[PDB]
Design an enzyme around this catalytic site. Structure first.
Site, PDB file in Angstrom:
ATOM      1  N   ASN A  30       0.837  -1.193   0.000  1.00 42.45           N
ATOM      2  CA  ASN A  30       0.000   0.000   0.000  1.00 42.45           C
ATOM      3  C   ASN A  30       0.871   1.241   0.000  1.00 42.45           C
ATOM      4  O   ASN A  30       1.843   1.299   0.768  1.00 42.45           O
ATOM      5  CB  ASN A  30      -0.919   0.011   1.229  1.00 42.45           C
ATOM      6  CG  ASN A  30      -2.006   1.079   1.135  1.00 42.45           C
ATOM      7  OD1 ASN A  30      -2.667   1.191   0.120  1.00 42.45           O
ATOM      8  ND2 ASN A  30      -2.165   1.883   2.191  1.00 42.45           N
ATOM      9  N   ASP A  90       5.638  -4.826   2.062  1.00 41.25           N
ATOM     10  CA  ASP A  90       4.496  -4.245   2.782  1.00 41.25           C
ATOM     11  C   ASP A  90       3.374  -5.282   2.789  1.00 41.25           C
ATOM     12  O   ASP A  90       3.633  -6.439   3.147  1.00 41.25           O
ATOM     13  CB  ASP A  90       4.143  -2.890   2.171  1.00 41.25           C
ATOM     14  CG  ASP A  90       3.080  -2.144   2.986  1.00 41.25           C
ATOM     15  OD1 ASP A  90       3.449  -1.545   4.015  1.00 41.25           O
ATOM     16  OD2 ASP A  90       1.870  -2.184   2.617  1.00 41.25           O
ATOM     17  N   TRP A  91       2.147  -4.930   2.392  1.00 37.34           N
ATOM     18  CA  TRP A  91       1.048  -5.892   2.471  1.00 37.34           C
ATOM     19  C   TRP A  91       1.136  -6.974   1.410  1.00 37.34           C
ATOM     20  O   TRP A  91       0.507  -8.031   1.568  1.00 37.34           O
ATOM     21  CB  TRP A  91      -0.297  -5.184   2.364  1.00 37.34           C
ATOM     22  CG  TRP A  91      -0.742  -4.656   3.688  1.00 37.34           C
ATOM     23  CD1 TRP A  91      -0.876  -3.345   4.044  1.00 37.34           C
ATOM     24  CD2 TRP A  91      -1.098  -5.425   4.844  1.00 37.34           C
ATOM     25  NE1 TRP A  91      -1.300  -3.254   5.342  1.00 37.34           N
ATOM     26  CE2 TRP A  91      -1.457  -4.518   5.851  1.00 37.34           C
ATOM     27  CE3 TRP A  91      -1.155  -6.796   5.119  1.00 37.34           C
ATOM     28  CZ2 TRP A  91      -1.847  -4.933   7.131  1.00 37.34           C
ATOM     29  CZ3 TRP A  91      -1.553  -7.210   6.393  1.00 37.34           C
ATOM     30  CH2 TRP A  91      -1.897  -6.280   7.376  1.00 37.34           C
ATOM     31  N   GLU A 103      10.657  -4.470   4.092  1.00 38.73           N
ATOM     32  CA  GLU A 103       9.653  -3.592   4.698  1.00 38.73           C
ATOM     33  C   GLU A 103       8.298  -4.305   4.782  1.00 38.73           C
ATOM     34  O   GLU A 103       7.246  -3.793   4.376  1.00 38.73           O
ATOM     35  CB  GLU A 103       9.582  -2.274   3.933  1.00 38.73           C
ATOM     36  CG  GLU A 103      10.824  -1.322   4.283  1.00 38.73           C
ATOM     37  CD  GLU A 103      10.710  -0.697   5.658  1.00 38.73           C
ATOM     38  OE1 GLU A 103       9.555  -0.499   6.086  1.00 38.73           O
ATOM     39  OE2 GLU A 103      11.768  -0.376   6.300  1.00 38.73           O
ATOM     40  N   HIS A 112      10.674   3.680   3.614  1.00 38.48           N
ATOM     41  CA  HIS A 112       9.794   2.512   3.453  1.00 38.48           C
ATOM     42  C   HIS A 112       9.711   2.039   2.003  1.00 38.48           C
ATOM     43  O   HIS A 112       9.716   0.826   1.752  1.00 38.48           O
ATOM     44  CB  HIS A 112       8.386   2.792   4.003  1.00 38.48           C
ATOM     45  CG  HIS A 112       7.373   1.738   3.649  1.00 38.48           C
ATOM     46  ND1 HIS A 112       7.276   0.538   4.323  1.00 38.48           N
ATOM     47  CD2 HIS A 112       6.407   1.712   2.698  1.00 38.48           C
ATOM     48  CE1 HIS A 112       6.288  -0.178   3.810  1.00 38.48           C
ATOM     49  NE2 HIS A 112       5.752   0.505   2.814  1.00 38.48           N
TER      50      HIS A 112
END
Length: 294
Positions: free
Chosen positions: A40, A107-108, A131, A272
């Site tokens: 995201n 991330d996701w 990350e 990030h």
């Protein structure tokens, strides 16, 4: 490279009631295959300067998660982890994959990729994560100080910041890239979310799914709890943790994963969205991981 140029190179496949758009470097090939999972609020476009360094060694696939990138939008606006997993898992089944794959995730995308690996343990040649979503958050002092940001985001104020002000694209995203994107690069991240309101729902639901031990959501909590346990004993799954310096979650992931078996760590410059600051080094590291495999 503009969004138009990138999505010109991608294809679409029907997935359940919808479609998903994805990059494919070598359609219909059962050679070495690497699948790149974004998070995201990005898309497959995040991997555009990383994939060239891997393409010579493997068929590279980069799907846009449902409701993101050029993938289709869900009429009911429900984009929880499990909704994303229904579509993403059906996509895996739809692109003519060989028996074993390497997952590169962020991330996701890493929450989804970790879960897909955990549910398909015999199909994982290797995992590169960065990350990533590696655990439930049980004590805040071992994580970046986001407690207040998360309560805010779950509040109606946060719905107004995301759905109406595009907080995640216009503020969070450039905040966590060290360099300045071009206007063309920023417009590519903006493209899926230009229409105010519910087009931006995936960017709001994702942070509401953060697994906080005691703040729910309990379905995500136990998904993450179960793939963390398996990864923590994954002694014969080669794993590359790409550490971003200073990063955002990287410091916490270093601590969480410190004793994970069969895990090599490489450190790159980034916050990030480390792919926008060190794509060459990240690409070279994945190739090195691939060659260490073969």
């Amino acid at each position: 490279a503009t969004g138009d140029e990138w999505w010109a190179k991608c294809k679409q496949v029907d997935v359940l009631d919808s479609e998903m758009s994805y990059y494919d470097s070598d359609p219909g090939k059962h050679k070495n295959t690497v699948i790149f999972l974004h998070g995201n609020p990005t898309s497959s476009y995040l991997w555009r300067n990383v994939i060239p360094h891997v393409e010579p060694l493997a068929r590279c696939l980069a799907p846009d998660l449902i409701g993101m990138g050029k993938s289709g939008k869900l009429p009911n606006h429900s984009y929880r982890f499990v909704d994303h997993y229904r579509y993403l898992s059906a996509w895996f089944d739809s692109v003519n994959l060989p028996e074993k794959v390497t997952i590169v995730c962020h991330d996701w995308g890493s929450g989804l990729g970790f879960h897909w690996c955990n549910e398909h343990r015999d199909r994982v040649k290797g995992i590169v994560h960065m990350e990533s979503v590696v655990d439930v958050i049980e004590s805040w002092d071992e994580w970046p100080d986001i407690e207040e940001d998360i309560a805010l985001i779950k509040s109606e104020a946060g719905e107004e910041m995301v759905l109406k002000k595009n907080f995640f694209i216009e503020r969070l995203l450039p905040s966590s890239i060290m360099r300045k994107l071009s206007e063309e690069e920023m417009d590519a991240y903006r493209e899926p979310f230009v229409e105010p309101g519910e087009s931006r729902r995936p960017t709001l639901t994702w942070p509401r799914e953060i697994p906080i031990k005691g703040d729910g959501p309990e379905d995500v909590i136990e998904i993450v709890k179960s793939y963390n346990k398996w990864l923590s004993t994954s002694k014969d799954i080669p794993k590359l943790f790409i550490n971003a310096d200073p990063g955002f979650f990287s410091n916490a992931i270093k601590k969480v994963t410190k004793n994970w078996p069969n895990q090599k760590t490489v450190t790159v410059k980034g916050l990030h969205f480390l792919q926008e600051d060190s794509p060459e080094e990240i690409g070279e590291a994945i190739a090195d991981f691939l060659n260490e495999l073969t």
